[PDB]
């Protein structure tokens, strides 16, 4: 197929980008993921997941003003247009982020624990143990990848040496260098669980389509079965 990814834009921008739906299809044109197709046309707002991104020819901790908090069609979380210095960027909004609020993005690992105010980003080394966090990086400067969905919140479980133990929302422990940045608080749109789809049409609007033949293997779906050993073959299906 003549499929070229829509994710071709190279320069970050605030303008929503026209994104092409896939239908669950590979670049080969064959269905790779079932149950995807249609839905409301959407525009993609490029999220800057690296909260500590000091502006060009600038460095050090910087503050930013929350211009607005907006619904994002491409996420469970709602996003925040936030402006600092002479630039604007989209970030993931925390639970109580409001328009006009101020946000701190620092790389400073203070000797003492920094007062953790919801919404600001500090290196994990600077946070008190037991603080709720989100938008957690795996490596310093990689960019947030974990705890990004609406209402999610990891816990800074431990800090020893230069390594911090985080409890991901799946209640799995993760080891990250304490120099990696995370933002304080739980992600916004905390009521995303309680939303009721109500009707099949709403899922169709969200772009989920009812799809069958999801396995493509001979015989379709087949649950795993325990293959009895030769000694145990005599007891597999004992008649009544």
């Amino acid at each position: 197929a003549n499929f070229v990814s829509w994710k071709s834009r190279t320069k970050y921008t605030i303008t929503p980008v026209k994104m092409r739906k896939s239908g669950g299809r590979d670049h080969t044109g064959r269905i790779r993921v079932h149950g995807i197709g249609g839905g409301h046309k959407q525009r993609y707002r490029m999220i800057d997941f690296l909260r500590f991104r000091p502006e060009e020819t600038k460095s050090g901790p910087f503050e930013e003003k929350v211009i607005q908090v907006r619904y994002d069609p491409c996420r469970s979380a709602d996003i925040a247009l936030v402006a600092g210095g002479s630039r604007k960027r989209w970030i993931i909004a925390t639970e109580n982020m409001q328009a006009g609020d101020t946000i701190l993005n620092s790389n400073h690992i203070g000797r003492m624990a920094v007062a953790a105010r919801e919404g600001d980003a500090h290196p994990l080394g600077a946070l008190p143990v037991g603080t709720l966090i989100n938008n957690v990086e795996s490596e310093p400067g990689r960019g947030a990848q974990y705890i990004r969905a609406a209402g999610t919140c990891g816990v800074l479980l431990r800090k020893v040496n230069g390594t911090a133990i985080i409890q991901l929302p799946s209640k799995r422990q993760m080891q990250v260098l304490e120099t990696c940045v995370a933002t304080v608080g739980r992600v916004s749109n905390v009521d995303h669980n309680k939303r009721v789809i109500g009707k099949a049409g709403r899922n169709r609007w969200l772009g989920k389509r009812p799809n069958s033949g999801r396995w493509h293997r001979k015989g379709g779906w087949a649950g795993r079965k325990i293959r009895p050993l030769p000694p145990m073959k005599s007891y597999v299906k004992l008649p009544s």
């Binding site: 070229v4 670049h27 910087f62 402006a83 600092g84």
Partner: protein, 392 residues
């Protein structure tokens, strides 16, 4: 995270043939064949020179080599720039103090009923109805059509006062005029390249509104600042620019003095339309730019407090909502935040009419709202007429 996936990035050229790595021998390529063959070496073609020269096949040089390129980056405000902080940002950029409401000097010009137009409300209602309903064979005219129409018809209605005011003969509304003004603000050099439209030029400069005492009183006022938003935000940071002050006209032009800048936000789509605050900011910046170009043309290119302040008006409208501005530039010493400050009187969100019903709404076969404007406000047209009559 890097933007732009590999599959969309330009493909890496195929590796060079190993024959090119062997020093002593000349590879045999398909260059002589004048066409590709897969079993011969790929030629290394020298770059082609005569290409990016033809006018229809031209490549501009890199920005570094352009004549007006400058290492110091100017911040330009053009017609399609939307200030984040709006009026506050414009006030900081222009070193201006805001005053709510139009000045009494201009507001009094319409208090007496002699200046009131005969059949004023009837004519204004006809203008609104023509712009919004009767303009075209189409049932509902779009904003791109009814904003310029409403502005031009209101201007004609005001110009009809030439009977009472013969001084109105010494003015003309020019279109597509473009001005440019540069000035410094705390080592930041800002330019305004105002294009807009409908510059009302007069043969005589407008009288100053603020007295010497008020201009000096502006010293105490502190210029409001916003943090962490820099005042530069949403201004085009450009290294290619011209620091010349252009008033938009050749020397010797009759009607040299700007009187009113009519800015109209006629975009059909709300996202393409300025917010009211951003429109007021654009009005402030364009009035300041025209006033500054006039000041640099008259009293030379010297930063100083103006002995004779330059007054420029502006009306910024979306077709329904109007904003009126009188800007007094009384200082070309903009770099410092201290001293006498320019001052702008702004009247905001003066809506000519609340809503217009192009179709008669019918509920249960009963006409509820008749066709036409609802909530028409003659006061806004009074203010418009006052601004037009100022200086006459």
């Amino acid at each position: 995270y890097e933007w732009g996936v590999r599959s969309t990035r330009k493909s890496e050229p195929p590796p060079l043939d190993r024959v090119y790595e062997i020093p002593g021998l000349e590879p045999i390529t398909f260059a002589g064949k004048m066409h590709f063959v897969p079993w011969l070496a790929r030629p290394i073609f020298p770059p082609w020179d005569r290409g990016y020269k033809d006018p229809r096949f031209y490549r501009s040089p890199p920005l570094h080599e352009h004549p007006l390129y400058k290492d110091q980056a100017c911040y330009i405000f053009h017609h399609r720039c939307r200030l984040l902080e709006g009026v506050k940002q414009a006030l900081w950029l222009t070193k201006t103090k805001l005053i709510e409401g139009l000045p009494e000097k201009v507001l009094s010009l319409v208090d007496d009923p002699r200046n009131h137009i005969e059949n004023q409300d009837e004519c204004v209602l006809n203008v609104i109805s023509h712009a919004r309903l009767w303009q075209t064979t189409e049932e509902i005219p779009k904003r791109e059509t009814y904003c310029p129409v409403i502005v031009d018809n209101l201007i004609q209605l005001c110009k009809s006062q030439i009977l009472k005011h013969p001084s109105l003969a010494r003015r003309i509304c020019v279109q597509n005029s473009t001005f440019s003004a540069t000035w410094n603000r705390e080592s930041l050099l800002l330019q305004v390249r105002g294009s807009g439209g409908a510059r009302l030029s007069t043969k005589d400069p407008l009288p100053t509104i603020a007295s010497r005492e008020e201009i000096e009183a502006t010293k105490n006022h502190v210029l409001e600042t916003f943090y962490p938003i820099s005042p530069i935000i949403d201004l085009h940071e450009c290294n290619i620019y011209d620091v010349k002050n252009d008033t938009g006209f050749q020397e010797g032009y009759p009607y040299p003095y700007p009187h009113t800048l009519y800015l109209l936000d006629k975009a059909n789509l709300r996202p393409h339309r300025l917010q009211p605050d951003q429109l007021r900011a654009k009005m402030i910046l364009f009035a300041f730019g025209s006033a500054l170009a006039q000041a640099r043309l008259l009293y030379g290119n010297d930063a100083k407090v103006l002995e004779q302040p330059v007054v420029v008006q502006s009306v910024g409208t979306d077709g329904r909502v109007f904003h009126f501005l009188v800007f007094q530039l009384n200082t070309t010493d903009l770099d410092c935040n201290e001293g006498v400050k320019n001052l702008a009187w702004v009247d905001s969100d003066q809506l000519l009419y609340q809503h217009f019903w192009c179709l008669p709404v019918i509920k249960k076969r009963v006409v509820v709202e008749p066709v036409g404007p609802v909530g028409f406000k003659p006061e806004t047209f009074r203010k418009f007429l006052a601004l037009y009559l100022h200086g006459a």
